[PDB]
């Protein structure tokens, strides 16, 4: 138990978690565009001129 | 009347003109008005509609 000074280390291992990327890199999934306003069907001339 | 729902391809005036055309009115919002003072039909073709007005609280009775 003299606890002498040992030599300098050769290198460094570093352990850390890696993320999973099987999900991302996929084609994007955007929010679907709301439709442009379309005229309602069944619009008729309700007003007829008097006389 | 939400903003940014009408593009330049599908215009707002085209849409509401097709609605007015389907109702048997003019495509451009105008009508044949007459003169209530003269009796005669006005030569111009007067743009009329339905606008929602607001009454502000600033009255001349407080001023």
Swiss-Prot record, chain A:
Protein name as annotated: DNA-directed RNA polymerase I subunit RPA34
Extra information: It is in an antisense orientation to and overlaps the gene of the DNA repair enzyme ERCC1. This gene overlap is conserved in mouse, suggesting an important biological function.
Subcellular location(s) per record: Nucleus, Nucleolus; Chromosome
Comp. bias intervals (Pro residues): 29-41
Protein task: Component of RNA polymerase I (Pol I), a DNA-dependent RNA polymerase which synthesizes ribosomal RNA precursors using the four ribonucleoside triphosphates as substrates. Involved in UBTF-activated transcription, presumably at a step following PIC formation.
Phosphoserine PTM sites in chain numbering: 26, 34
Gene name of the record: POLR1G
Residues of the full protein shown: 103 to 153 of 510
Membrane-spanning parts: none
Top-rank taxon: Eukaryota
Disulfide bridge positions per record: none
Spans annotated as Disordered: 18-41
Family stated for the protein in its record: Belongs to the eukaryotic RPA34 RNA polymerase subunit family.
Subunit structure: Component of the RNA polymerase I (Pol I) complex consisting of 13 subunits: a ten-subunit catalytic core composed of POLR1A/RPA1, POLR1B/RPA2, POLR1C/RPAC1, POLR1D/RPAC2, POLR1H/RPA12, POLR2E/RPABC1, POLR2F/RPABC2, POLR2H/RPABC3, POLR2K/RPABC4 and POLR2L/RPABC5; a mobile stalk subunit POLR1F/RPA43 protruding from the core and additional subunits homologous to general transcription factors POLR1E/RPA49 and POLR1G/RPA34. Forms a heterodimer with POLR1E/RPA49. Part of Pol I pre-initiation complex (PIC), in which Pol I core assembles with RRN3 and promoter-bound UTBF and SL1/TIF-IB complex.
UniProtKB/Swiss-Prot annotation, chain B:
Transmembrane region(s): none
Disease: Treacher Collins syndrome 4: A form of Treacher Collins syndrome, a disorder of craniofacial development. Treacher Collins syndrome is characterized by a combination of bilateral downward slanting of the palpebral fissures, colobomas of the lower eyelids with a paucity of eyelashes medial to the defect, hypoplasia of the facial bones, cleft palate, malformation of the external ears, atresia of the external auditory canals, and bilateral conductive hearing loss. TCS4 inheritance pattern is autosomal dominant.
Shown segment, full-protein numbering: 947 to 1009 of 1135
Assembly and binders: Component of the RNA polymerase I (Pol I) complex consisting of 13 subunits: a ten-subunit catalytic core composed of POLR1A/RPA1, POLR1B/RPA2, POLR1C/RPAC1, POLR1D/RPAC2, POLR1H/RPA12, POLR2E/RPABC1, POLR2F/RPABC2, POLR2H/RPABC3, POLR2K/RPABC4 and POLR2L/RPABC5; a mobile stalk subunit POLR1F/RPA43 protruding from the core and additional subunits homologous to general transcription factors POLR1E/RPA49 and POLR1G/RPA34. Part of Pol I pre-initiation complex (PIC), in which Pol I core assembles with RRN3 and promoter-bound UTBF and SL1/TIF-IB complex.
Localisation per UniProt entry: Nucleus, Nucleolus; Chromosome
Top-rank taxon, per record: Eukaryota
This protein's name: DNA-directed RNA polymerase I subunit RPA2
Domain statement: The active site comprises the fork loops, the loops and the rudder that stabilize the transcription bubble and assist polymerase translocation.
Family: Belongs to the RNA polymerase beta chain family.
Stated role: Catalytic core component of RNA polymerase I (Pol I), a DNA-dependent RNA polymerase which synthesizes ribosomal RNA precursors using the four ribonucleoside triphosphates as substrates. Transcribes 47S pre-rRNAs from multicopy rRNA gene clusters, giving rise to 5.8S, 18S and 28S ribosomal RNAs. Pol I-mediated transcription cycle proceeds through transcription initiation, transcription elongation and transcription termination stages.
């Amino acid at each position: 138990g003299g606890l002498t000074c040992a030599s300098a280390p050769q290198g460094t291992l570093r352990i850390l978690e890696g993320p999973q990327q099987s999900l991302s890199g996929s084609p994007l999934q955007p929010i679907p565009a709301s439709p442009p306003p379309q005229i309602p069907p069944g619009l008729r001339p309700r007003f007829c001129a008097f006389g | 009347a939400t903003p940014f729902i009408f593009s330049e391809e599908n215009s707002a005036l085209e849409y509401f003109g097709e609605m007015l055309k389907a109702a048997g009115y003019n495509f451009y919002g105008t009508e044949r008005l007459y003169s209530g003072i003269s009796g005669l039909e006005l030569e111009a073709d007067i743009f009329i509609g339905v606008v929602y007005y607001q009454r502000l609280r600033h009255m001349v009775s407080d001023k």
